[PDB]
Coordinates of C-alpha atoms in Angstrom, one line a residue:
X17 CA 0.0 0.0 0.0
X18 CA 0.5 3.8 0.7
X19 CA 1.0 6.4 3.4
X20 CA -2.3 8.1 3.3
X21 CA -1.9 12.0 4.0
X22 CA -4.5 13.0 6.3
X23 CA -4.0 16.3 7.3
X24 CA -5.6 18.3 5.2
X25 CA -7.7 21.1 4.6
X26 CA -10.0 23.0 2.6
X27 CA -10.2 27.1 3.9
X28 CA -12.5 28.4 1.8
X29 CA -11.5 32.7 2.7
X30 CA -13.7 35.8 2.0
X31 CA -11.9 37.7 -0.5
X32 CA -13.1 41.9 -0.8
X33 CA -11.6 45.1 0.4
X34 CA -14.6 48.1 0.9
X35 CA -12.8 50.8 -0.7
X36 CA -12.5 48.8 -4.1
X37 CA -15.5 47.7 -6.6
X38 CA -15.1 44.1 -7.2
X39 CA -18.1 42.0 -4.9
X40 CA -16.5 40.0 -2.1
X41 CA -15.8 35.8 -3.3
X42 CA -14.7 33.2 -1.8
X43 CA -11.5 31.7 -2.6
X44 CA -10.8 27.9 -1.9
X45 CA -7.2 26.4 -0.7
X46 CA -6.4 22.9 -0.2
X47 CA -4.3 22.9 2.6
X48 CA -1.5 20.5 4.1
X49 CA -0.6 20.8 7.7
X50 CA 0.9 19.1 10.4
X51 CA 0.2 17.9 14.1
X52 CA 2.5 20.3 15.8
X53 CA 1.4 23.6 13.5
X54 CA -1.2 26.7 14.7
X55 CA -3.5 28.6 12.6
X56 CA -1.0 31.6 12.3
X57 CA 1.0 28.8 10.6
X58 CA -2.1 28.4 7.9
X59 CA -3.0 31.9 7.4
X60 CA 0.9 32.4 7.2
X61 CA 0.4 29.9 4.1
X62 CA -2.8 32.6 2.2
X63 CA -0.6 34.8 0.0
X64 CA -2.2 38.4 -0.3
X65 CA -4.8 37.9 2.3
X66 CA -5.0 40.3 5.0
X67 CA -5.8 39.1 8.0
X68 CA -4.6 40.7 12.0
X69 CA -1.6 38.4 13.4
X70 CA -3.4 38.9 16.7
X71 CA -6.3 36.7 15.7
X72 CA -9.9 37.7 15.3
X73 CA -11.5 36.1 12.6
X74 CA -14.4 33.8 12.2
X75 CA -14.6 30.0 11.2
X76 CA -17.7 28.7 10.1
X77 CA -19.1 31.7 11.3
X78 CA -18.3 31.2 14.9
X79 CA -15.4 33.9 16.2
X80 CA -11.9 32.5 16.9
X81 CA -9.4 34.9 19.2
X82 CA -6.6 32.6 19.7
X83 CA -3.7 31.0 17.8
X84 CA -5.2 27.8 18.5
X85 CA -3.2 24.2 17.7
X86 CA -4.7 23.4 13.9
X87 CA -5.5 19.9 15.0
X88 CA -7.4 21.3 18.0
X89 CA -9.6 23.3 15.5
X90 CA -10.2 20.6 13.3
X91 CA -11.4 18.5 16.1
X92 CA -13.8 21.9 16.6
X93 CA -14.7 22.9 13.0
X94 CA -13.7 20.1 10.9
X95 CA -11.7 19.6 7.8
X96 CA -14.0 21.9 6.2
X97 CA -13.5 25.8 7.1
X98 CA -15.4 28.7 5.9
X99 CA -12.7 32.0 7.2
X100 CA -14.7 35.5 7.7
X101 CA -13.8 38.6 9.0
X102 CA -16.0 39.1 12.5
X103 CA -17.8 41.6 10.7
X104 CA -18.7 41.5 6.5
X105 CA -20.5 44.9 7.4
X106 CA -17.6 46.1 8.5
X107 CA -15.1 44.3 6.4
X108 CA -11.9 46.3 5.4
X109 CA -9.7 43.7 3.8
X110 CA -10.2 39.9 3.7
X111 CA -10.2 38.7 7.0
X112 CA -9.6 42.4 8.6
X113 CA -12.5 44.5 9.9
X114 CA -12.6 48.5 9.8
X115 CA -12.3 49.7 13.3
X116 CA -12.5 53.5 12.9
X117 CA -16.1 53.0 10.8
X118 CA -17.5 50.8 13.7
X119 CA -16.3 53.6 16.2
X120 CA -18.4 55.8 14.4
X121 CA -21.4 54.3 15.6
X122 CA -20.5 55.9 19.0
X123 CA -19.9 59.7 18.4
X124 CA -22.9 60.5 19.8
X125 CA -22.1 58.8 23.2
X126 CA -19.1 60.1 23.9
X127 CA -20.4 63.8 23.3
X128 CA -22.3 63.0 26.3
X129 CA -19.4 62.2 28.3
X130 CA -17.1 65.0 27.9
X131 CA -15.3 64.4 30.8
X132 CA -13.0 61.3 29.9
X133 CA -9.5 61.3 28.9
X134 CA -8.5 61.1 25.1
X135 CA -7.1 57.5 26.8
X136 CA -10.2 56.6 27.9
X137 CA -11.8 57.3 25.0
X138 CA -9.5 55.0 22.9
X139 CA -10.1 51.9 25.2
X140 CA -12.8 51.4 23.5
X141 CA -10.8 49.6 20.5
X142 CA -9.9 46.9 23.0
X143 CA -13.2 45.9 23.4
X144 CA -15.4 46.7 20.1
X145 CA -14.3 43.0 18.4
X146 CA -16.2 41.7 21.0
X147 CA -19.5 43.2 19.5
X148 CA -19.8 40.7 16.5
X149 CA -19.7 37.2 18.9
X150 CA -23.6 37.9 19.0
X151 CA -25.6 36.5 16.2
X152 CA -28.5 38.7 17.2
X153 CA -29.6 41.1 14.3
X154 CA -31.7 44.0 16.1
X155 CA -29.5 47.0 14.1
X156 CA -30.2 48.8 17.4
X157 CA -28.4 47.2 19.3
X158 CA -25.0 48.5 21.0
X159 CA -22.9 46.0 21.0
X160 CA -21.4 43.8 23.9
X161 CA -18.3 45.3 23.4
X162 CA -19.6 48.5 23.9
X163 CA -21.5 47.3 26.9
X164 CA -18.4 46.2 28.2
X165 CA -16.3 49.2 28.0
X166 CA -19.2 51.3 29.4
X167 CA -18.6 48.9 32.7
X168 CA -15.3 49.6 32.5
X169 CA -16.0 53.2 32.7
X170 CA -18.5 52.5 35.8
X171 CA -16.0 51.1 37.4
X172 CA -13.3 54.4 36.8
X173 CA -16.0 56.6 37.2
X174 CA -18.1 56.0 40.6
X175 CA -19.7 59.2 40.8
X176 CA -21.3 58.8 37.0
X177 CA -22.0 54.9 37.5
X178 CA -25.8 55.3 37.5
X179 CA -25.9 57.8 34.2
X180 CA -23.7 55.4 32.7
X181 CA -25.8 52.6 33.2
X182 CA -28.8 54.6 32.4
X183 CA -26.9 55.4 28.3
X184 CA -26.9 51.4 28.5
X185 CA -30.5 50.9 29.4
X186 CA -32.4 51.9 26.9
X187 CA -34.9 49.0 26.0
X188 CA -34.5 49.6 22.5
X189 CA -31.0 49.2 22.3
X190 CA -29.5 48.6 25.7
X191 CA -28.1 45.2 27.5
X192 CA -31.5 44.1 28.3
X193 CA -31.2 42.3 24.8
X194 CA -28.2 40.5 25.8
X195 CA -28.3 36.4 25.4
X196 CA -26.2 34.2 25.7
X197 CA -23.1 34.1 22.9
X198 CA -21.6 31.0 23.8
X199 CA -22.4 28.8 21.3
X200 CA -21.1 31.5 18.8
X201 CA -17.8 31.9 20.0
X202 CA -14.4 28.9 19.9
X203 CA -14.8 27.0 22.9
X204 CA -18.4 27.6 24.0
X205 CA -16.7 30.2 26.6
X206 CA -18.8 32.1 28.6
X207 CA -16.9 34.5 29.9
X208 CA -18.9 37.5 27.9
X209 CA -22.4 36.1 29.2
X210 CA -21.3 36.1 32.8
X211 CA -19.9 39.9 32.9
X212 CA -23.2 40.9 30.5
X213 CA -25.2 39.0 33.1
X214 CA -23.5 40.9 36.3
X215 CA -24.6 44.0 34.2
X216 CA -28.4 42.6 33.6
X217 CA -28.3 42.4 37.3
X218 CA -27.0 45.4 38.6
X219 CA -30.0 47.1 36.0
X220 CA -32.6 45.1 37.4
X221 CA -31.7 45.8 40.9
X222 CA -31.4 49.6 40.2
X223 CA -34.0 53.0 40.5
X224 CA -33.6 53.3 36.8
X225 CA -37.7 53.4 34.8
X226 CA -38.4 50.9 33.1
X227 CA -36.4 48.3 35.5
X228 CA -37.4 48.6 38.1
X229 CA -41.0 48.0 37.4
X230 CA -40.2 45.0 35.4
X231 CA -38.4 44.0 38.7
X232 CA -41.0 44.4 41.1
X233 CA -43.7 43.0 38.9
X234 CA -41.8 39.8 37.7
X235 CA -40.8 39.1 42.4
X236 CA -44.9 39.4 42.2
X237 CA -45.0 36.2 40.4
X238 CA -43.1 34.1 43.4
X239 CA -46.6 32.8 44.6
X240 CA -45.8 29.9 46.8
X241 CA -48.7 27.0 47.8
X242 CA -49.2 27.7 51.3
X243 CA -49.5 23.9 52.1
X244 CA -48.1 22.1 49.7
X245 CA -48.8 18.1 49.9
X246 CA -46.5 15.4 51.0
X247 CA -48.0 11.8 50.3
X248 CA -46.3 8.7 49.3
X249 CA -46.8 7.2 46.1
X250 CA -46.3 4.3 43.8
X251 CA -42.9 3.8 42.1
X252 CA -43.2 5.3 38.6
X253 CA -45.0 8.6 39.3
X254 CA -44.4 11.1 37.7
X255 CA -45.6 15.0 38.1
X256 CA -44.8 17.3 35.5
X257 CA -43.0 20.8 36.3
X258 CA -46.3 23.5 35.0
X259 CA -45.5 26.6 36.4
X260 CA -45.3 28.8 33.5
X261 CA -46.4 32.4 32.8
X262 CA -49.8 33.1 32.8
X263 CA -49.9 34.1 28.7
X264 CA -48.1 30.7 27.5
X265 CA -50.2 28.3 26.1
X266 CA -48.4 25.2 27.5
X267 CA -52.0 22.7 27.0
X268 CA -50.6 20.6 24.2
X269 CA -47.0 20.3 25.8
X270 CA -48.4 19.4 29.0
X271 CA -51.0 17.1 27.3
X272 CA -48.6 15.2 24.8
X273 CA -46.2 15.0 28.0
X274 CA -48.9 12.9 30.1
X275 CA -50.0 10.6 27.3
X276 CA -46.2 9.6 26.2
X277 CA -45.4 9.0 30.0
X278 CA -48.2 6.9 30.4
X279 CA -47.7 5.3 27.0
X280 CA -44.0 5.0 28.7
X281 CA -45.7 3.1 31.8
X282 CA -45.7 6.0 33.9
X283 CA -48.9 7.5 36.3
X284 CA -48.7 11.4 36.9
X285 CA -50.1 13.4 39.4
X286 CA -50.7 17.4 39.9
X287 CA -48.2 19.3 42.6
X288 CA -48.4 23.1 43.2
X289 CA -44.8 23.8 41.9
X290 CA -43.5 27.3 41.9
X291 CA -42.9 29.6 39.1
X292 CA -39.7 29.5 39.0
X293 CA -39.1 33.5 37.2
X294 CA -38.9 32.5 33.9
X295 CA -36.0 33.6 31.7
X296 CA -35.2 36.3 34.2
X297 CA -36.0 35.9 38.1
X298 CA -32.8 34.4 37.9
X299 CA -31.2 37.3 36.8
X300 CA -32.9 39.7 39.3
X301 CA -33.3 37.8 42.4
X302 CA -31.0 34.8 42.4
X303 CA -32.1 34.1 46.2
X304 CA -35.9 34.1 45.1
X305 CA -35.1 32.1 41.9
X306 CA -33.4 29.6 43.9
X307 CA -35.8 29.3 46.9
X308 CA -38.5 28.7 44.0
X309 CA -36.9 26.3 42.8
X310 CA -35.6 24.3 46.1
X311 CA -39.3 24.4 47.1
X312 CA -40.1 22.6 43.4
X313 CA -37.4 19.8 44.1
X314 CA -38.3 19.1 47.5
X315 CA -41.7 19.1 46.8
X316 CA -41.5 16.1 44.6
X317 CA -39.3 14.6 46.4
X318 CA -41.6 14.8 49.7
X319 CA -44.3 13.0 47.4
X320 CA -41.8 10.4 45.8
X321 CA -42.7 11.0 42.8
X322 CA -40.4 12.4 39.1
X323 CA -40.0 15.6 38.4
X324 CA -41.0 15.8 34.5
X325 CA -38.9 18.7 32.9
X326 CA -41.1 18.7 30.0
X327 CA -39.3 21.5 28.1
X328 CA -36.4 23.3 27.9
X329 CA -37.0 27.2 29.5
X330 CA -38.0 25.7 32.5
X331 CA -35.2 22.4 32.7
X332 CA -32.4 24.9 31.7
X333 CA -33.3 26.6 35.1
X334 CA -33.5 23.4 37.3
X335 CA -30.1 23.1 35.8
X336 CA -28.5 26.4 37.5
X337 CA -30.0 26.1 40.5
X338 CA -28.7 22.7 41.2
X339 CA -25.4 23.7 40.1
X340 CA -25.5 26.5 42.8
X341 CA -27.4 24.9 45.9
X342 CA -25.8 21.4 45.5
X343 CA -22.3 23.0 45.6
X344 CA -23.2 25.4 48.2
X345 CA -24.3 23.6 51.3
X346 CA -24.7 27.5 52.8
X347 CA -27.2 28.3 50.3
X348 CA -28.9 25.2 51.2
X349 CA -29.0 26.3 54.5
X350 CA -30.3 29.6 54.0
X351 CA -32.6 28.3 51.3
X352 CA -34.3 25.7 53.8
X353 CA -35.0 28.6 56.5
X354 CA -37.2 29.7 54.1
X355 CA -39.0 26.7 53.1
X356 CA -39.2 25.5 57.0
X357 CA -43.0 27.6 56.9
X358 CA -44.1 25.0 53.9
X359 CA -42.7 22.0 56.2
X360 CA -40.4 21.3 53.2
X361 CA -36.5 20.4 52.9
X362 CA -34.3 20.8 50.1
X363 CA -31.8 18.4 50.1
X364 CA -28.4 18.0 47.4
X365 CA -28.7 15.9 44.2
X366 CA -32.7 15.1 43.6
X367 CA -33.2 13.4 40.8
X368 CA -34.7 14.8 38.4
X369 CA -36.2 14.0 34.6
X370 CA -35.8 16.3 31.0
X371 CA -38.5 14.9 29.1
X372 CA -36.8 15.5 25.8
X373 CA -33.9 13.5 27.1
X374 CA -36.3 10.6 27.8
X375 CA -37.4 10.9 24.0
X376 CA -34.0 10.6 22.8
X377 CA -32.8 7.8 25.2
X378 CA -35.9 5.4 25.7
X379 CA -36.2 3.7 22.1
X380 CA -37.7 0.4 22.7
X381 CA -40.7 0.5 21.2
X382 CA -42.5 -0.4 17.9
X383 CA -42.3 2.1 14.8
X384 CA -45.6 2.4 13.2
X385 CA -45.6 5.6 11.4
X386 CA -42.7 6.4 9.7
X387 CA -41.3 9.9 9.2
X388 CA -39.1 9.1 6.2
X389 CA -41.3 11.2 3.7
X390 CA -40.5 14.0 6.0
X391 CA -38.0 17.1 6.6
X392 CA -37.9 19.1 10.0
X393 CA -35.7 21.6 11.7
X394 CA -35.1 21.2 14.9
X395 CA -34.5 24.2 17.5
X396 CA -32.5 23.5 20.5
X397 CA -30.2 25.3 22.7
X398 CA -28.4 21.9 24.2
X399 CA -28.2 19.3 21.4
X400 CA -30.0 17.7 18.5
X401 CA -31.9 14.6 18.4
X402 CA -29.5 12.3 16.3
X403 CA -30.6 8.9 17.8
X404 CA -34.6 9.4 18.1
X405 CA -34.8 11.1 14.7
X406 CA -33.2 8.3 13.2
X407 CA -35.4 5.7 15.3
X408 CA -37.9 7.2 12.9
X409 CA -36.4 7.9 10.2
X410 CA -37.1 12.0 10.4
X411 CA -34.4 13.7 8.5
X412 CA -33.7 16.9 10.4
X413 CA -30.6 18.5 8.7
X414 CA -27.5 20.6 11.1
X415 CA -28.1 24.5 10.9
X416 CA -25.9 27.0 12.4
X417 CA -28.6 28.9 14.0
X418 CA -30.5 26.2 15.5
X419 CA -28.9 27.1 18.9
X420 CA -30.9 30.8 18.8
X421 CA -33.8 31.7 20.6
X422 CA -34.5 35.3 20.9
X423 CA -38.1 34.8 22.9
X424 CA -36.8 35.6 26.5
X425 CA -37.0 39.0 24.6
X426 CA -40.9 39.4 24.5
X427 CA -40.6 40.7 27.6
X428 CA -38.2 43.2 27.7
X429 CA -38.0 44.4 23.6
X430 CA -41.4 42.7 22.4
X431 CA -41.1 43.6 18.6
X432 CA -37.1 42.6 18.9
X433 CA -38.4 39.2 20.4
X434 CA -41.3 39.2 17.6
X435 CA -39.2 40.3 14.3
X436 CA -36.0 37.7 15.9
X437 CA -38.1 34.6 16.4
X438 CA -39.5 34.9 13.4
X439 CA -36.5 35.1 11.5
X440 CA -35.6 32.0 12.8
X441 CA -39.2 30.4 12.2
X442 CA -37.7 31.2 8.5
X443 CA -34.7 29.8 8.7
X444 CA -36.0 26.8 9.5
X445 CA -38.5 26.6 6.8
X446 CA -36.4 27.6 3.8
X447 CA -34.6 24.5 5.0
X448 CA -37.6 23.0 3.2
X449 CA -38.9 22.0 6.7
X450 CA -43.0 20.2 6.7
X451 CA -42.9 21.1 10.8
X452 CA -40.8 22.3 13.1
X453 CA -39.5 21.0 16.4
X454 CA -39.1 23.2 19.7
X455 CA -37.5 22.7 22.4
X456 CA -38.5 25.9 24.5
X457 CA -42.0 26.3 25.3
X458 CA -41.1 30.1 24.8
X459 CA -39.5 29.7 21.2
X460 CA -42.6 27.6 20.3
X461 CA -45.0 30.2 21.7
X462 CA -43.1 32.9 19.5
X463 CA -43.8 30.4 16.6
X464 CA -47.1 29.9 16.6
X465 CA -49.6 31.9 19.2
X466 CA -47.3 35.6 17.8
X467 CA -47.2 33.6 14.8
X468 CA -49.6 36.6 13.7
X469 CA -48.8 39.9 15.1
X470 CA -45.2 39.1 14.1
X471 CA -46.3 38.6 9.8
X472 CA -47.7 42.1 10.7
X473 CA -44.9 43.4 11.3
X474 CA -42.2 40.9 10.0
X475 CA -42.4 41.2 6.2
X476 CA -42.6 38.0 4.5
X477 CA -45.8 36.4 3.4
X478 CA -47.6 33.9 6.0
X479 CA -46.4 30.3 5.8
X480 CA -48.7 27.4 8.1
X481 CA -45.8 25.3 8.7
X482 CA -46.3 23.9 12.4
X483 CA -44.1 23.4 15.3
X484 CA -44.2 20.2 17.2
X485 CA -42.8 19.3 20.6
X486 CA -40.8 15.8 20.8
X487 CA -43.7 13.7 22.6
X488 CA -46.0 14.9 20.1
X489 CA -44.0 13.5 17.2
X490 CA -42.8 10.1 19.3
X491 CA -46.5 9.5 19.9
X492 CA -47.4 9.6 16.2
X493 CA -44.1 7.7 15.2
X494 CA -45.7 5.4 17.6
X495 CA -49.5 5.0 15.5
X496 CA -51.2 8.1 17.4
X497 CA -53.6 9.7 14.9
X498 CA -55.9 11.5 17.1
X499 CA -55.1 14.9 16.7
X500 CA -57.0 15.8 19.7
X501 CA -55.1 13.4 22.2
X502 CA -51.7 14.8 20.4
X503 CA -53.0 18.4 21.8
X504 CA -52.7 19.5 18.2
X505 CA -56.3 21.1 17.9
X506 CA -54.5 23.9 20.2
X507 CA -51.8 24.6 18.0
X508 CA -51.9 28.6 15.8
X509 CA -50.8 26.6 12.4
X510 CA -52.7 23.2 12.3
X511 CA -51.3 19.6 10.9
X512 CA -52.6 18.4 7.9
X513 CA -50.5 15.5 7.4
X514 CA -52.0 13.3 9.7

């Protein structure tokens, strides 16, 4: 035989420059490299492509700022890479983005704050890359680098800190829009969504109109059962988590849920569970937020019974809370003074259930209706569902923005939330999607109930594709045609192929 060479590329790298008039291309190299080599050592290999030595750039459309080992980036990206400036808005050259036309953008803002040094001023630079990690495309918006350098300026500037934060507030534009990046950037670090959280935070909990309204109205919404019940029950029982804002329409979710447990040889029974805040409690009362949802887990676990996570707004936030009172055994403490008036006691590691995970992990069972004449697109900010999909033959192709969900936003930027959501309903259906699948109650409320004030303001013509949650399409994959029992009669855009 012979040696096989393995390591090998193909970069496929924007080529433009904005002060000349040919349209920007993409120009395809076929790469060797070896083991020990770093992408400076690649880019070092793109004759006549500008590109910063301190890197910056995006690969496959997520944002790279490190000279990272080339086989650690394969592992990451693949053997296939797409190379982008952060910004083709902004693009100077190639792979370069122009600096002084983004800092444009803030002329205005720092006419208002006469008072810093020329220095001061020019930090700003340091920081503005960091503005094109979000995928977000509210035009708006300032920019988390921006919002960043204005808390570095809070920070020098103690006596200005709360007219500062109030140039940052502004729902329109300000860093209540911020969500998580994450996904978006080389490692999945969240180093950005932490410091933009601490920020969210310090809004909420200040005098500043329209916060602290939103503030005081959303700790309303901590409504705890008085006497919440504690009796033993049969092994597999099962009570699924329901405490969801008022407007969601969560019947068919909640519906669907019960019948595939039961069809799973599960029983379920009702608990008073707490709202747990939503999206944001956690963000403006991480104390309340965590009390809520102590007083959850220890209720089922009082009754013996599974908590069913059945979507993923509400299991995302079962997830943080655990992480912090099951680390903490001071929270705990302080946590259970609080629930000692309900005669409940939270207690590390309950176990609890994601009913989505269930879907994807519990496959013995008969396929009856195949989905192999089908196509959906699947929306999901923790993973797709490889192994299920292809228990029933659903193709469900990979899409970068799958991971978005811009309807925490309703509630703070309502036609940001509403013109966001529904770019991403489109996304998924010029994937040539028949339905599509969410995840988050929210995202699927954006889909479907705002399905209509959105096409009045979102301008594309109306499309009656449908959104399905996982135990609605595991049920028909497993013969259920009753629309009804499926909870589909409840759905904005109905299903016609069954």
């Amino acid at each position: 035989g012979s040696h096989m060479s393995v390591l090998k590329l193909h970069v496929k790298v924007f080529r433009f420059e904005t002060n000349k008039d040919y349209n920007p291309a993409y120009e395809s190299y076929f790469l060797e490299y070896q083991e020990d080599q770093y992408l400076l050592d690649l880019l070092k290999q793109l004759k006549g492509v500008s590109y910063s030595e301190n890197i910056a750039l995006k690969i496959n459309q997520i944002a790279v700022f490190e000279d990272a080992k080339v086989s650690d980036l394969v592992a990451f990206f693949s053997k296939e890479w797409v190379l982008d400036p952060l910004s083709k808005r902004y693009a100077l050259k190639d792979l370069m983005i122009d600096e002084k036309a983004v800092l444009k953008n803030y002329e205005d803002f720092f006419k208002q704050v006469p008072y810093i040094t020329k220095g001061e001023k020019e930090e700003l630079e340091k920081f503005i890359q960091i503005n094109f990690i979000n995928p977000q495309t509210n035009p708006k918006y300032l920019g988390d680098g921006f919002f960043l350098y204005v808390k570095w300026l809070m920070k020098r500037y103690p006596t200005e800190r709360d007219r500062l934060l109030e140039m940052i507030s502004q729902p329109e534009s300000g860093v209540m829009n911020f969500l998580s990046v994450a996904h978006y950037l080389y490692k999945n670090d969240d180093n950005i969504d932490h410091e933009i959280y601490e920020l969210q935070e310090i809004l909420t909990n200040s005098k500043i109109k329209p916060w602290k309204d939103f503030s005081k109205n959303l700790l309303s919404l901590f409504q705890y059962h008085s006497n919440p019940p504690k009796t033993p029950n049969p092994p597999k029982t099962c009570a699924l988590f329901n405490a969801y804002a008022k407007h969601l329409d969560v019947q068919s979710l909640l519906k669907s849920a019960k019948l595939y447990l039961e069809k799973m040889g599960q029983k379920t029974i009702d608990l008073p569970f707490c709202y747990d805040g939503g999206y944001y409690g956690k963000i403006i009362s991480t104390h309340d937020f965590l009390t809520a949802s102590a007083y959850n887990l220890a209720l089922a676990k009082a009754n013996g019974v599974s908590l069913i996570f059945c979507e993923e707004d509400a299991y995302l936030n079962i997830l943080h809370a655990k992480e912090v009172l099951d680390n903490n055994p001071e929270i705990i403490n302080s946590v259970n003074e609080k629930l000692k008036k309900y005669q409940l006691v939270y207690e590390k590691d309950i176990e609890i259930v994601y009913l989505n995970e269930w879907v994807n992990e519990f496959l013995a069972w008969e396929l009856k209706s195949p989905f192999d004449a089908f196509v959906g697109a699947e929306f999901s900010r923790i993973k797709q569902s490889d192994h299920f999909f292809n228990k029933i033959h659903l193709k469900a192709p990979h899409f970068l923005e799958s991971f978005q969900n811009y309807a925490p936003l309703l509630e703070v930027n309502e036609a940001s939330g509403l013109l966001q959501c529904a770019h991403l309903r489109y996304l998924g259906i010029d994937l040539g999607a028949d339905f599509l699948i969410a995840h988050s109650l929210g995202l699927f409320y954006a889909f479907e109930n705002l399905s209509l004030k959105a096409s009045k303001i979102y301008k594309r013509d109306n499309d009656n594709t449908p959104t399905l949650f996982l135990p609605q399409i595991a049920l028909m994959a497993m013969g259920e045609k009753n629309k009804q029992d499926l909870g589909l009669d409840t759905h904005y855009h109905k299903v016609t192929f069954i």
